[PDB]
Amino acid sequence: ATVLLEVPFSARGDRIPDAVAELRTREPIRKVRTITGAEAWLVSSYALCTQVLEDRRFSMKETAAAGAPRLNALTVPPEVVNNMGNIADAGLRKAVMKAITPKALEQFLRDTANSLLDNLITEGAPADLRNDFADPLATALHCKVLGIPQEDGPKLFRSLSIAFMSSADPIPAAKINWDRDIEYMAGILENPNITTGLMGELSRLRKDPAYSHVSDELFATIGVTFFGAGVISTGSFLTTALISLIQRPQLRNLLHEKPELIPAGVEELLRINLSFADGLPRLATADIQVGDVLVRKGELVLVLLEGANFDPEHFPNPGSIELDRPNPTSHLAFGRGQHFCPGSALGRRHAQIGIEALLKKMPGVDLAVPIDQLVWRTRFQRRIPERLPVLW
Numbered sequence: 001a002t003v004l005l006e007v008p009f010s011a012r013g014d015r016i017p018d019a020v021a022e023l024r025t026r027e028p029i030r031k032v033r034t035i036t037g038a039e040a041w042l043v044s045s046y047a048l049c050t051q052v053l054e055d056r057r058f059s060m061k062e063t064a065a066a067g068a069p070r071l072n073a074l075t076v077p078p079e080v081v082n083n084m085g086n087i088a089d090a091g092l093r094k095a096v097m098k099a100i101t102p103k104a105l106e107q108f109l110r111d112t113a114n115s116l117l118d119n120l121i122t123e124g125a126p127a128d129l130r131n132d133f134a135d136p137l138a139t140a141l142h143c144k145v146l147g148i149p150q151e152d153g154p155k156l157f158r159s160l161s162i163a164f165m166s167s168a169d170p171i172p173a174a175k176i177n178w179d180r181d182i183e184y185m186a187g188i189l190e191n192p193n194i195t196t197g198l199m200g201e202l203s204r205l206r207k208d209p210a211y212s213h214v215s216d217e218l219f220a221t222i223g224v225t226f227f228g229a230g231v232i233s234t235g236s237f238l239t240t241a242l243i244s245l246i247q248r249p250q251l252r253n254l255l256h257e258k259p260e261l262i263p264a265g266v267e268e269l270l271r272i273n274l275s276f277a278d279g280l281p282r283l284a285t286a287d288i289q290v291g292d293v294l295v296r297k298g299e300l301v302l303v304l305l306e307g308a309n310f311d312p313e314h315f316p317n318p319g320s321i322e323l324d325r326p327n328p329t330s331h332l333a334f335g336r337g338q339h340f341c342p343g344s345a346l347g348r349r350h351a352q353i354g355i356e357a358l359l360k361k362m363p364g365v366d367l368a369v370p371i372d373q374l375v376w377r378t379r380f381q382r383r384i385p386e387r388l389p390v391l392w
């Protein structure tokens, strides 16, 4: 006798488990047990993953309902799961988008990357590319985008190792750090020195008559959530993309020699990325046929991003980085449908400029320890190594 198949399969972000291609072939939608003990449907083909993400009857907001089967415990108030919907309803969507584009900024990214790298070179090998390069780069970018002081970035950043946990039970430290971070953002909206970036724009709109009935809670929430999601997602993706690049010295050499090819290489590094640790969660609001399974109202569905993005029926020779594919941006790294990532262009540009600056300064970058010695963070919403030691 064996127990029901458990998720997630492995916290390692340097290799995809053989089980993924086995499931996809034999049972592309199948029952599994989450860390809470709840049952869920795990979806692993490109076709079925797209079907779920494009049908709003599979609901993000209803995952917060009391009594529902859960992937993991909430780390935010339940109304905050419907964050984008709340922004839209307030008439703030277009203003938020415009403030988080990369086209405002790029020269600030380049100068910041180059300064971080020069400091590593001065100190001498080994260097830690996560704690002393990718995560500070992400932190600095989001303080500039929000319009807040660079010197505030480190304390906001320290909440994230707990805020983005994937836990079976509620986490007391997440509420302590949330309430404090909300009080900070509320203080920013009342600070007359803050007149640029996303928080500068929200601070103006707050006093305009067309927004007089929008709550002060929502304005502070937008600042905490966009800082947190953008900094964890960009820092974690750049770190694990740098591992994928270092393990491919022929590609590293080619991008060094021809940096025009960096945007096509970053699109492939997004396609093969293992940064999301769990499937994307949805709750069925109706009975809906998905492949051979009739999913019932009230059941939990998990959309496995690497199931879609390594599917050979959609991307032939899926484990290989190919810079001349006919369908290069059709991957699901930023999601699909109603909830498609609002920061996609800013995330692409963070990774392009970081990689471009690294290869120019350190063309002989390599790991300084055997790859099996990297320590993979567990029970977390991302897969990341705790330290990334390199030489050059």
Ligand code: HEM
Residues within 6 Å of the ligand: 060, 083, 084, 085, 100, 225, 226, 227, 229, 230, 231, 233, 234, 237, 280, 281, 332, 333, 334, 335, 336, 338, 339, 340, 341, 342, 343, 344, 346, 347, 348
């Ligand atoms: C390479 C970097 C990034 C990746 C891989 C990424 C990935 C994703 C994914 C897969 C989703 C969909 C979640 C779902 O449907 O359940 C998403 C949504 C979201 N992302 Fe990103 N993201 C990145 C960068 C950013 C940045 C830079 C920001 C903001 C500054 C951001 C803010 C958000 C927000 C607020 C949502 C929720 C949208 C909603 O609920 O409608 N992300 N991201």
